[PDB]
């Protein structure tokens, strides 16, 4: 599914992301916008053969097992395929582990380049 902005904001809030590990809800909405354009089925292949999966573009090099990425660590203990659901639970649970790993939201390239530094709460304005 393709979420609307406030629809996703409300779903992420229900799933506990607002202010999680210090990151306000707008950070997470901005991240999803620029990672997947709000599409839970988005996937993008990386140079190193790893792939990003789902609404938050979780990378199989470190976080999930897709059976085809060498150097797999599968730190979220989840098949990458499971992150392509219209229900955001599995992606949120992995996201919580990523942001706790000790480096903020910097793991998300789109967030680090295109959200970090901006007025992120604009992404939940009107919701």
Q: Residues 31-61, buried b or exposed e (16+ Cβ, 10 A)?
A: bbbbbbebbbebbeeeeeebbbbbbbbbbbb
Q: Is 66 annotated as a binding residue?
A: no
- What is the set of active-site residues? 35, 52
The CA–CA distances, whole Å, from 89 to 15, 26, 70 equal 7, 18, 26
Instruction: Give the DSSP H/E element, type plus range, for residue 24.
Output: none
- Annotated binding-site residues read 101
- Annotated binding-site residues for substrate read 101
């Amino acid at each position: 599914k393709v979420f609307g902005r406030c629809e996703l904001a409300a779903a992420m809030k229900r799933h506990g992301l607002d202010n999680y590990r210090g990151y306000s809800l707008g950070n997470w909405v901005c991240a999803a916008k620029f990672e997947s354009n709000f599409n839970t089925q988005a996937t993008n292949r990386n140079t190193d053969g790893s792939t990003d999966y789902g609404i938050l573009q979780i990378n199989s090099r470190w976080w999930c097992n897709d059976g085809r990425t060498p150097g797999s660590r599968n730190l979220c203990n989840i098949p990458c395929s499971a992150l392509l659901s219209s229900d955001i639970t599995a992606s949120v649970n992995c996201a919580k582990k990523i942001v706790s790993d000790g480096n903020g939201m910097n793991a998300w390239v789109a967030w680090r380049n295109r959200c970090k530094g901006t007025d992120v709460q604009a992404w939940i304005r009107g919701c």
